[PDB]
Amino acid sequence: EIIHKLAMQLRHIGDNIDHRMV
Amino acid sequence: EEIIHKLAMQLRHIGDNI
Amino acid sequence: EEIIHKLAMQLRHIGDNIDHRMV
Amino acid sequence: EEIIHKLAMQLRHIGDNIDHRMV
Amino acid sequence: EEIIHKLAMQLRHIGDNIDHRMV
Amino acid sequence: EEIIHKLAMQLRHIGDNIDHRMV
Amino acid sequence: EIIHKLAMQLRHIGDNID
Amino acid sequence: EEIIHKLAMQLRHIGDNIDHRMV
Amino acid sequence: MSEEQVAQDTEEVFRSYVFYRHQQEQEADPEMVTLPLQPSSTMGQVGRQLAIIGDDINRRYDSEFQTMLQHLQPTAENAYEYFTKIATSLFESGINWGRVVALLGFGYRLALHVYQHGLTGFLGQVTRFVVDFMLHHSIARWIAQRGGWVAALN
Amino acid sequence: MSEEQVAQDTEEVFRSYVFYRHQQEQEDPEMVTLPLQPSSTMGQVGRQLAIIGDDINRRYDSEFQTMLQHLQPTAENAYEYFTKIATSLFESGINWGRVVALLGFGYRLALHVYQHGLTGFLGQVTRFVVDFMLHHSIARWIAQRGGWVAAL
Amino acid sequence: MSEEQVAQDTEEVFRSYVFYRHQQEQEAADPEMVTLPLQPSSTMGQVGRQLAIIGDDINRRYDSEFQTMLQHLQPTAENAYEYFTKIATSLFESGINWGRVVALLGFGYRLALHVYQHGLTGFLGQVTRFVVDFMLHHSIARWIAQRGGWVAALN
Amino acid sequence: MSEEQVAQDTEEVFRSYVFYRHQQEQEADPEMVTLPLQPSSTMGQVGRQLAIIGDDINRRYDSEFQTMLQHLQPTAENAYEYFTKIATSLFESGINWGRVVALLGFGYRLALHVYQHGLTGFLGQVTRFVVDFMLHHSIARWIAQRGGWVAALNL
Amino acid sequence: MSEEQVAQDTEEVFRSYVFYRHQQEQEADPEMVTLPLQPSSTMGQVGRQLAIIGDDINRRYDSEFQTMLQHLQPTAENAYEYFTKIATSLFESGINWGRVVALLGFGYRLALHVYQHGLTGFLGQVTRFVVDFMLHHSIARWIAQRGGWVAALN
Amino acid sequence: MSEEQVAQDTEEVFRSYVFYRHQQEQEADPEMVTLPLQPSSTMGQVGRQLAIIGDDINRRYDSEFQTMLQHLQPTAENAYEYFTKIATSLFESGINWGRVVALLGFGYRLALHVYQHGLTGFLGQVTRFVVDFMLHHSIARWIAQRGGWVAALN
Amino acid sequence: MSEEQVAQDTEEVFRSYVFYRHQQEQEADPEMVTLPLQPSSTMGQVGRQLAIIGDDINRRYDSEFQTMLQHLQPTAENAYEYFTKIATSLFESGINWGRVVALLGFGYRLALHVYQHGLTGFLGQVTRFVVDFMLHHSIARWIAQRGGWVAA
Amino acid sequence: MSEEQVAQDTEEVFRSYVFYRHQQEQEADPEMVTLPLQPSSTMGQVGRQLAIIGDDINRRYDSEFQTMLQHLQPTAENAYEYFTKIATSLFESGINWGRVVALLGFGYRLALHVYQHGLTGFLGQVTRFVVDFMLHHSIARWIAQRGGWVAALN
Amino acid sequence: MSEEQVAQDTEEVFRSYVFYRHQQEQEAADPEMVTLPLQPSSTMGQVGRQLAIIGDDINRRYDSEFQTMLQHLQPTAENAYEYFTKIATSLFESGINWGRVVALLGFGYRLALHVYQHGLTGFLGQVTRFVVDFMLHHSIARWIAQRGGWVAALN
């Protein structure tokens, strides 16, 4: 359950760094 | 003979308008 | 040269949006 | 290439103004 | 010779694809 | 016989990937 | 284009170090 | 032939460079 | 771009034009509405885009123009005599793409008038009249030089 | 599930896509009569993915048709243009959304050329789609998720 | 299984592939292939029917460039073996698999068909001989042999 | 009428055009007043004519044209290139009699701007750029199909 | 650009990622301060650029992140399992570069959190779980299509 | 070029591949660091180049292999049987130059396995497995038909 | 005075420039303060008087310049392409003694922007850029026509 | 001074050019660090000066040569053929002392390149190509007509 | 390539040209041309197959006045060679051409068909000999053998 909550939080930091980075 | 001159000069206008 | 990109940029917004619904 | 074009594109106008005095 | 070679690579390609289909 | 085969199939994968480099 | 405005400025100080 | 030749003229260039220095 | 290359391509550049121009002229003749179109050629696109750029200018002079073709009254024999004769003058002044669509428009208008006067199956000659004249009167060598018919897509 | 597997299943995924997307458009002859594979799970893939973008593809229409007309895709540059647009779509990233936005580019260019006199080219669009996806890692993406059947 | 057993056996797996792939294509002509006789009760016509089956999707696609390339080649009666040999050695220059052996059979088919269509009639026994002669001299018949023969292709 | 008989009358047509129109304009260029013409030159009327009928049009665009080519500042080296290059784009859109005359006017515009700029004697080369561009772009064929330069006396 | 070179370069990008991000988050981990960086590498400036971009998109989730990594309580036995179990769900929705910086960023947040519970000298294995997850899960193949890690300087 | 020539040339192609691939892997087994090389043969150029193209693929498929060999437990007596049986099914479906390099990698992976597990001084046995398997199972013949091992430097 | 001797002398002309100019801007880069300096050579004084006769006009244009190198963002691989290409145009207008101290001044900053961007151990290559560009583009020679760097 | 005197004198000019040029550069190929040098020969002073009087020019184009030599893929078998073809094209337009120094350095660059690519103990073969080329292509006679290699120390 | 070798080749080039042109003309009758038998596996049938198709587009602009000129000729079994010979020597009197060799075979076809419709049955074999015997005796076969033979035409 945790292992998952770790991925989706990181999706949000990734796609937020995304717009910043494109 | 004369009608012949008449078609060519029309299309010409049409052509140059195009 | 600048049309191909403007197509792939919006094409990307259609994907980005559709992605939100699928996933 | 812009000096070349506008020079040519200039020459068409006098080429169709002088064409009418011709035809 | 440039044709003979183009014909031989289309044949490798169709060959390796049928290949993936057989194993 | 069953471990043997998994070594052979992995060598095929490695081999076919290196082939794609040399051709 | 960045390459030109680099030298352009470096020219400025240059002739000013003169 | 074509790789071969490019190495030769490179050698000429370095070769004529060094000449002027010793001359 | 080869000369008669542009020639062979003139086969369906025309067949396209007449197809699309009639589909809009109505806005009839089943020899053209049914005129079979090839699959997957850019030459079809050329006949459609020129079909719809000249259409408006090809919408005023249709009254005055075909009134002449009656007083001329061309048959199935002098048709090529008449065609070449008018088209030799249409270019005797000066060449350009506007007039290249004017020849095809005469090709659309001669086709239309022969059906409407009892001449049937002659669209298969008003095509050939259009392809031979151009390869034998320096027009196909005018088109091949600028990239061809695809160059007209501008 | 192999890349080859996804490549083949892609043929029906597209021809199976266009069909239901055109039908849902009306509520092209070559798109109404578009033959569909009997009993394939892929046949359904091409209509689930057609119904999901019904919102996002509803708005972006008048967008795309003006940009296509100025690009003027003929039978020659058709693949050139397809590979070059679609490459630029996936450089930034990949995701299922941009997978679906790529098939929409296959329905929109299929439909553009037919309207511009390219009768019977939908058979080359399908291959532009499948040949762009096998030579540019997009097929390898999908099979890694299970194949198109994962999209559902 | 010996080399010449596989080489002898390639007469009927090729002749059979041809009849069956044509019968394939023509339900979706080369009457030399429709009226092709098929040897009674041999597993090699079994093998030819399976190989013709397997090879359609991949083929059904690349039927345009092949047509146009074979046209600018203009093979004749005199140069067709040389071209067959030159193309066939470049195909296995990089490697040998079973799909490339079926791919080889298909270009014997594509070739026998193009030259007929272009006026080379009754040429099917020579194309068959190119196929049988290339395999034996360029080691294709030996690769097939050290795996059971052509019948092994039925998996 | 061979498109080559058009090729040599043009060496006489251009020179005439430059000269007869030089004098009307003076109302300079040594090389254009030195400029001699063969006698009983029927093509000299042509260059006299073509300079006339197009004068009141050519007395309008003389403003913006003296500043355009100077930014080009042709040389002895890039003068032919700029010639053929400017002239290819004047007929990519359409031929007619004015565009061919409007072509010669610019050689004069070039052969004179070049003299005021210090390129003495370049009057011979400007005549070739005309002939040479005209033969090698199907402009001389257009003239021999219609008859030749004599038929330009019907304007 | 071979995928093999991206993965060998990932050594430098991560090491420098940890060192250059730690240098900002410290204004501690002894292994990450004293962290050495090879000289005259582009993966050294690349490490620098990825650690400076989403600073706030990283300083925005410290509570949520350092809370879940503590109930999970990673050890030196299950570390890699968790690393790959988590990292699979990350790019399963899709690939972009922000998620590639998000992969690294978690390692810095793993290797450090882990460090704070007593697991000394563990920074060279977190460097390893990053390198041996990308090459084996197409993350080093995606980067190879674009040029490498240096292209990330745009 | 003979197949027997390719077979005797295979001793130095293999010996060198081991030397140079071990040498990058280190950036252990001393029988491969001390491995003698023949002076001025282009078969040492072959084994240096082939050691290097297996750079991406071979790094990935690493612990995957050692865990499978650990289950094999090849000894001095069943290793040639085991070498043969794996290698025989690698080429059952086909041959290409890349599979030839994967057969030198498995000779390297198995030469190293047994050293690390206590079979010292066996490097020269793994070399004959490679030479002998290649000469009885048509691999040398295949290579000789392409100009020899030297054709691989493309 | 050979150009080559001018080129070999430039090595410590730059080090001393880079060493001494950094000591100015300071009152960081531990590659330029540690920067060992050769003993009892005029070239240590040559580079010393040119790093000081330039701190008026340079110390001002710093922000203008470094903002461009963060837009240019040079790497360990394109550094030579750039440095050559900037300094090349710098000198296609002409050559004076201000512009040679102006050149060495860009080596000071280029070797400093990449240090401040994470490119360690490159200060030894920035001297080479100077030493190579000058001989290969006729600047070691022009300096030699006066007497060397010593005239400065 | 005979051309055969220059021909036998050339082995020591080349061997010594390699040693001293490898030495400045290194400030690697241990066949060149441990390269023996004849005592009290003036020819060891000729290779020392020829090696220094190309230093800067030579490092300048170092990268172009390496990458051009890799596509050549010289072997033990084709290195002479390749050495001769490059070297006959170098002097086809002209002979001067610098070009003679450039034929030494290309003997040095081909010698090092094959070593780095795995052809060991080949230094002596490269010295023979240098010497046998020069004798058989009039480069030795050129030099003998000027006092020998010793004339170069100016 | 021997010019006497180009003579037997012409028997199968003409008979192939006949069959295939007739065939493609129909599909856009002389049943001696529908039932025309063709050598199996001869390159010369590929020649006659290609020579029929290149002329097709032009050979539909002139099908008319040819028809009406051969009517006032009124060829017979007796005068047809003579008229054939005299039409064919006048065709190559001003020059020889690959196209005039295809226009020679075409008049063989068009005269072979005129006589048939006009009641001369069983005459194709005499026409083929007019073509074969004219070409030999009037240096047309030597020209082609110099070019490489009829197969040179598949280019």
Residue numbers in the entry:
A (entry chain V): 77 to 98
B (entry chain N): 76 to 93
C (entry chain T), D (entry chain X), E (entry chain J), F (entry chain H), H (entry chain F): 76 to 98
G (entry chain P): 77 to 94
I (entry chain W), M (entry chain S), N (entry chain G), P (entry chain E): 22 to 48, 56 to 182
J (entry chain U): 22 to 48, 57 to 181
K (entry chain I), Q (entry chain K): 22 to 49, 56 to 182
L (entry chain M): 22 to 48, 56 to 183
What does the paper say about this structure?
Bak is a member of the Bcl-2 protein family, which comprises 3 subgroups: proapoptotic BH3-only proteins, antiapoptotic Bcl-2 homologues, and downstream MOMP executors Bak and Bcl-2-associated X (Bax). Once activated, Bak and Bax undergo a conformational change to oligomerize on the mitochondrial membrane, which causes MOMP to be characterized by loss of mitochondrial membrane potential (ΔΨm) and release of cytochrome c. Pxt1, a male germ cell–specific protein exclusively expressed during spermatogenesis, was reported to contain a BH3 domain and to induce germ cell apoptosis and male mouse infertility upon overexpression.
In this complex structure, the human Pxt1 BH3 fragment forms an amphipathic α-helix and is accommodated in the BH3-binding groove of the single Bak molecule, similar to its binding to the corresponding region of Bcl-xL, with the equivalent positions of the 5 key BH3 consensus residues. With the lack of detergent treatment during the purification and crystallization steps, C-terminal helix swapping of Bak was not observed in our structure, which was reported to be induced by the combination of detergent and the BH3 fragment and necessary for the 2:2 complex form. The intermolecular binding between Bak and Pxt1 was mainly mediated by hydrophobic interactions: 4 hydrophobic BH3 consensus residues (Leu82, Leu86, Ile89, and Ile93) and 2 additional nonconserved isoleucine residues (Ile78 and Ile79) of human Pxt1 associate with Ile81, Gly82, Ile85, Tyr89, Phe93, Met96, Leu97, Leu100, Tyr110, Lys113, Ile114, Gly126, Val129, Ala130, Leu131, and Phe134 of Bak. The guanidinium group of Arg87 of Pxt1 also forms a hydrogen bond with the main-chain carbonyl of Ser117 of Bak.
